[PDB]
Every structure is written in structure tokens, then in C-alpha cells.
A paper describes a structure:
When first described, [name] was placed in the so-called “repair of iron centres” (RIC) family and proposed to protect iron–sulfur enzymes that are damaged by ROS or RNS. We now show that the previously enigmatic di-iron enzyme [name] functions as a nitrite reductase, converting nitrite to nitric oxide (NO), and we elucidate the structural elements that support this activity. Using an integrative toolkitX-ray crystallography, solution NMR, AlphaFold modeling, and pulsed EPR/DEERwe solved the full-length homodimeric structure of [name] and identified a robust di-iron center that forms stable iron-nitrosyl intermediates. Our findings demonstrate that [name] harbors a di-iron catalytic center, consistent with its placement in the RIC family.
We also analyzed a cysteine-free variant (C30A/C31A/C191A) by SEC. This CF variant produced a single peak at 10.9 mL, confirming that [name] is a homodimer in the absence of intermolecular disulfide bonds. The crystal structure demonstrated that the CTD forms a homodimer, with each monomer encompassing a hemerythrin-like domain that binds nonheme iron. Based on the crystal structure, residues H87, H132, E136, H167, H211, and E215 were identified to coordinate the di-iron center. These residues are highly conserved among [name] homologues. Additionally, the MV-based assay showed that mutating any one of the six di-iron-coordinating residues abolishes nitrite reduction, confirming their critical role as identified in the crystal structure. The dimer interface is located between two intermolecular α-helices (helix 5). From the X-ray result, we observed that residues near Ser77 (S77), particularly S77 and Gln80 (Q80), appear to form a hydrogen-bonding network that brings the two monomers into close proximity. Notably, the catalytic efficiency (k cat/K m) for CF [name] is ∼2.4-fold higher than that of WT, indicating that the three native cysteines (C30, C31, C191) are not strictly required for nitrite reduction.
Residue numbers in the entry:
A (entry chain B), B (entry chain A): 67 to 224
Write the structure that this text describes.
Amino acid sequence: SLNPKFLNVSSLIQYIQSAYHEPLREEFKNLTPYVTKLSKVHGPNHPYLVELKETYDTFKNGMLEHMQKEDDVDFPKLIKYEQGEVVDDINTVIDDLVSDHIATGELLVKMSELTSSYEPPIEAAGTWRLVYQRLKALEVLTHEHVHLENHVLFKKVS
Amino acid sequence: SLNPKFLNVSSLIQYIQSAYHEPLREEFKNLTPYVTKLSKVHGPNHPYLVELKETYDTFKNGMLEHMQKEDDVDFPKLIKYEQGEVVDDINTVIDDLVSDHIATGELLVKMSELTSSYEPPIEAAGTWRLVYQRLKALEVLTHEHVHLENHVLFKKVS
Ligand SMILES: [Fe+3]
Ligand SMILES: [Fe+3]
Ligand SMILES: [Fe+3]
Ligand SMILES: [Fe+3]
Ligand SMILES: [O]
Ligand SMILES: [Zn+2]
């Protein structure tokens, strides 16, 4: 059980990528077909499952583009700033990054509302219950991720 | 709390250095005079105290040179190996580094045995109680330090 205090910016970014980015990206690939099946089968008579599908999709692609910007563009800046080099939009960067976290957040709220905190109705079975199950764990994984970035990584630079 | 398995060999090595190596060095600066003093004072009265001074000093000079071996020659050889460059001598390193861990190992046992189990007599006061506390302190940081290397960093490359 590491103390993050002792991880520098470059290594903490690494941990965030191995523990959160790469695990999230993979799950978004495995879950997505289940989430679309649930909406195609039981959406016809449960419309909220389609709102769930549509919301999950938006949260999903929101994450994936966001991470790409962090990995390929914005974490490199967070490093070179703490590596001394002049990065004059460091405050801009960090601001857009929380704008993104906030927004993905109120999206996770929406999914948690629609599912009633991921408790299936009894008349759910099979896919329906797995979808809820995995989303709940994804909601948890996403909160940890962003809390680590927000309250650890973004404070080492500012 | 953070999971060390997700760090790669180079991020983990940085962690070892900040969290363990640089602390241990700085503590050896601070604690060494007290050991010598407690040995000088109540050491005649009780000789096992000077057995302790000489045992601690051996474990000190040991750790110190062994961490410089890792910092200057062997944590490089491990990074360059994880990075894909051709490092033979790799298991020769991993095997000497545990040769030195197993060493500090049975040595820390003896310091602990010498000093009841870091239990100070009823005669002890001031100097004598600080040293035992700071040693049992130091004794546990080394367990963490050499358990991290042994079962994470070394099992990463192996
Ligand atoms: Fe991220
Ligand atoms: Fe993020
Ligand atoms: Fe070490
Ligand atoms: Fe070591
Ligand atoms: O993220
Ligand atoms: Zn797109």
C-alpha cells in the first residue's frame, strides 16, 4: 500500500495509467456490447434502459477522448512543468481537466439515478443484472481515478 | 490506497528511493551518535549494549553501501533490462541483491535479540529509551524496504 506522497509527478501519472486508464479502456470494450444488448432487447418496453444506453455511451466516449488528451497531450505538460520547463498554459490545462471530471461526474449521477443505484428490478436476469453490476464497479473505479488525479496529481503541480 | 504492483520497474525504483533509501540514509546520520553514546555510558555497566553498537554499525555500513550499489549500478541495470536493452548478469544481480537482503535479514534479528525485543530495562531512561524506539522504528522500515524490492521489483523482471 503505497504512500503517494513519495511518488513524483512522472511516476504518479504512470500509476494512474496502469491502474485506471488502461483498465477502464479495456472494460469499455467488454461492457459496451452487453449495454447495447440490454437496450435493444428490453428497451422497447423499458425506455429508461435506452436512456441508460445513450447516457453510458456519452459517458464512455467522453472518458475515452478525455484520457487520450491526458495521455498524449496534457500529462506530458504536467511533467515538463514539474520538470521545470516553461509550460505557460499549465493552469489552463488543469482547468479543462476538472471541467471534464465535473462533467463526467454529473453523467455518472445520471446513470446512477436511472438504474436506482444499480439495483436491478427482480424481473431482471442475465444481461440486465450483469450490466448494472459492471457499471456500479465502473462508477467506483471512475471515482477513485478522478479523486487521485484531482486531489493528488493536480496538487503536486499547483 | 495505492497498489505497488501497477508501477513499472522504473517508477517503482523511484518510489524505493524517495520512500526508503533517502530516509534510511538520513536516519543513519541522526541515530548513529545516540547508539554510540548509549554504548559509551551504560555499555560498561551492561556489555550487551556494546554488542549492539557494533552490530548496528555493521548493519548501518551494510545498508549504506548496499543502497549505493542499487542506486548507482543495479537499479540502472534493471531499468535498462525492463527497457529491452541486453542485460545479461541480470539474475546474477537479483541473486546478489538478495544475498545482501538475507544478510541485513539475520543481522536485524540479532539487534532485536540483543535488546530484549526492543524492550528497555527499568534502569533505562533518556538516551536509552530513544535509541530502542528509533531502532525498532528503523527495523520496520527495512522490512518494508526489502519486502518491496524482494517480492515486487525483483519479481517484476523475473
Ligand atoms: Fe485519467
Ligand atoms: Fe481524468
Ligand atoms: Fe534498497
Ligand atoms: Fe535492498
Ligand atoms: O480520466
Ligand atoms: Zn469521437
